[PDB]
Amino acid sequence: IPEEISIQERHDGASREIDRKTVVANLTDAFEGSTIRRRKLIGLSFGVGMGAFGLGTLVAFAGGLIKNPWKPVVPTAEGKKAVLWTSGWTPRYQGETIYLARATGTEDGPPFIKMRPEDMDAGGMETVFPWRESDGDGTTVESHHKLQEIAMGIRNPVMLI
């Protein structure tokens, strides 16, 4: 392909004076032929109406997402508390036994087993979860779901040393 050089002559800067004058004349005639300059009640009415419609529509469009973080939804032994203050280590009926259960990683019947003091050495660390006997092993579907909800909790895991 042959080699070339080309020059373009930008023609940059502000527009030509005839162009500027004609555009301004068009817009000015459009604005002052409508007489809107002397209808203050109509200007105010349009402003108020559009403001009300826009605000109502925006509030309706954005209101479905907003949720109150502090409403009591979690049942405890002292009523109902907000999610961000409860853990799963919180007692539910004033005296319930919550064990420190360790995970087996297995899917046979237990994914969580109890612990005794002698099930560890003086240099051991173990991750433990709250057991709550009424959950049982994960043989039935309801117990499987309870154990899944135990395992998927961001404030559940505890380090025992």
Binding site: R16, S34, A60
Partner: protein
């Protein structure tokens, strides 16, 4: 402000393209807003769909409801059905939004069909605008399939039945490719685990993007190939008579947009559409007397209902009956974009056209279009066989046979009647051109003759009878009152009159204004 505009000029300096677009002229005919209806429906669809995507989960994995709608607590459903139930019952405004969405989809389809009717019957598809006809046809097909995929996302019983029957069982029966297409589309057998996410992707991204691109190209072609117009006083094949964009056309377009949004909001609030909770989740063992997809897909359903069972069995092979339905559907989809070229080949007319035709002046094409609309209406009524038989006390077998026979005997009858009707309208125009407008007043002519006192539109002879005029493709007045004859009541408001001086002044001003308007348009 002066400073902002001055800086915009010194930086981008349009100032001539801006003027060129501010002085663009558009014709003002009520029928040229039918495409705007579809455009505004599409904008509302975009907004409401973007809202809906923040709450939907298009998965087919099964769960138990355990929600607020008690009559469904404990039922095994999919994640998509549960997401739709949550949108309906637990988001503040979600039911309202999805009802607006479905109503906007129906208005979109109806507006597209009415606009196609206008284009076809006025002839705006001729030589310069054939490519735009083709683009519009593609847009119609795409809108049909987009809506079909749309109402199948909430995987409930009725939409699942429609999916199964139409998509799965008609794809599966195609002659050679058939099961290969079915398995490439479903990932296997009919109820899989990828169909709903695949349709969700296709429905929120692919088809909307293609439709947006095609709408852009369509509107660009309409903007740069100027609009057609009807024949009239000052109108010519070389000019455009109308209003300029800047003060008037933008105002009218925005007002129409607001009005259409208002209508859609009213009917999305006041009328219930697709109550999925009265149904259940889709299950292959349950069925209901419910059928009939959205109205823009009803003609395929009616064709499948009234087609006779003609199958073919040869060496270890089978061609079932729905292959006929698929063939007729594809034949329609092919014949729709080819009509401009077929008509120009038949008529031998290869000229350029900027002036529209009146439907009465093209009797053969008007009769063709009426026949096609009659065929479509028969197929659409055949889709509601059971509802018609239940509400209007007719037998089900009777309705089936009525549709089967009407589909063949009604369209040519409509063709014949439409032809004769257009010619009769032409003869009425010719009578009004030859004599004057009939005024309705009778005289008795002392020797006992009754006359009718016509009113001429042009010059009369020395004997008083008007001189006949020539037809020019424009409508002719038939009522005396549509010409200024007996009008302009008192100039009060509704209960108290103004002053007589003000009334007379306003009358004279209006008369002078209308006279100068008609003069300025007729003389030049």
């Amino acid at each position: 402000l002066a400073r902002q505009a001055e800086d915009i000029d010194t930086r981008y300096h349009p100032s001539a393209a801006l003027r060129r677009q501010l002085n663009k002229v558009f014709p003002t005919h009520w029928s040229f807003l039918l495409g705007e209806i579809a455009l505004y429906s599409f904008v509302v669809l975009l907004i409401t769909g973007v809202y809906l995507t923040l709450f939907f989960d298009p998965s087919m994995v099964d769960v138990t409801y355990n929600g607020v709608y008690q009559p469904l607590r404990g039922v095994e459903m999919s994640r998509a059905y549960q997401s739709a139930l949550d949108i309906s019952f637990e988001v503040r405004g979600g039911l309202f939004v999805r009802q607006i969405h479905h109503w906007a989809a129906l208005m979109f389809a109806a507006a597209i069909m009415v606009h196609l009717a206008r284009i076809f019957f006025t002839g705006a598809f001729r030589r310069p605008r054939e490519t735009n006809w083709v683009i519009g046809s593609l847009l119609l097909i795409l809108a049909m399939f987009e809506g079909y995929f749309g109402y199948s996302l909430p995987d409930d019983l009725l939409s699942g039945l429609g999916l199964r029957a139409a998509l799965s069982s008609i794809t599966l029966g195609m002659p050679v490719i058939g099961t290969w297409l079915h398995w490439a589309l479903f990932g296997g057998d009919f109820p899989g685990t990828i169909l709903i996410p695949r349709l969700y992707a296709l429905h929120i991204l692919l088809l909307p993007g293609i439709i947006l691109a095609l709408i852009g190209l369509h509107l660009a072609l309409v903007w740069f190939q100027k609009h057609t117009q009807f024949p009239g006083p000052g109108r010519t094949e070389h000019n455009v008579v109308g209003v300029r964009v800047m003060p008037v056309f933008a105002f009218k377009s925005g007002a129409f947009f607001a009005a259409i949004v208002g209508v859609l909001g009213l009917m999305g609030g006041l009328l219930q559409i697709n109550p999925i909770w009265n149904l259940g989740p889709y299950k292959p063992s349950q069925v209901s007397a419910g059928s009939q997809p959205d109205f823009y897909m009803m003609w395929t359903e009616g064709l499948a209902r009234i087609w006779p069972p003609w199958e073919f069995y040869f060496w270890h092979h089978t061609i079932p009956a729905p292959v006929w339905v698929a063939v007729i559907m594809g034949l329609v989809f092919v014949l729709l974009p080819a009509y401009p070229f077929l008509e120009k080949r038949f008529t031998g007319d290869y000229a350029h056209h900027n002036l529209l035709q009146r439907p009465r002046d093209v009797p053969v094409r008007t009769a063709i279009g009426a026949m096609a609309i009659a065929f479509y209406m028969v197929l659409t009524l055949a889709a509601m066989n059971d509802i018609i038989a239940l509400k209007f006390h007719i037998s089900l077998n009777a309705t089936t046979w009525i549709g089967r026979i009407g589909m063949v005997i009604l369209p040519p009858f409509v063709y014949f009647i439409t032809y004769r009707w257009c010619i009769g309208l032409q003869r009425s125009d010719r009578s009004v051109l030859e004599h004057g407008v009939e005024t309705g007043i009778i005289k008795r002519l002392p020797h006992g003759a009754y006359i009718e006192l016509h009113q001429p539109l042009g010059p009369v002879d020395e004997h008083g009878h008007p001189i006949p005029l020539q037809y020019q493709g424009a409508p002719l007045p038939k009522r005396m009152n549509k010409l200024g004859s007996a009008g302009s009541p008192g100039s009060g408001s509704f209960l108290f009159a103004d002053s007589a001086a003000e009334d007379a002044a306003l009358r004279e001003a209006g008369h002078a204004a209308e006279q100068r308007a008609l003069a300025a348009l007729r003389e030049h």
